[PDB]
Target: Acyl carrier protein
Amino acid sequence: NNHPEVKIKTILSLFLNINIDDFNMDANLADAYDMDSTELADLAKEIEKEFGISVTKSQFSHWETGRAVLDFVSSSLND
Model:
């Protein structure tokens, strides 16, 4: 539940096959890391598994950057 930035940075780095200290949390995922629709859906399934939360397609469509994923997950865990 705590240090959620480091966990999300780690998850996104592993998912996108990027070195952890090369990952930019404020970069557009589609532009910086060539994220497509299929991958974003797959990322959501990993987030669901790793944190034990639910994610609709409407919710994860707004995951434009790593920071959007972080802030969604943080508020989802507070609920």
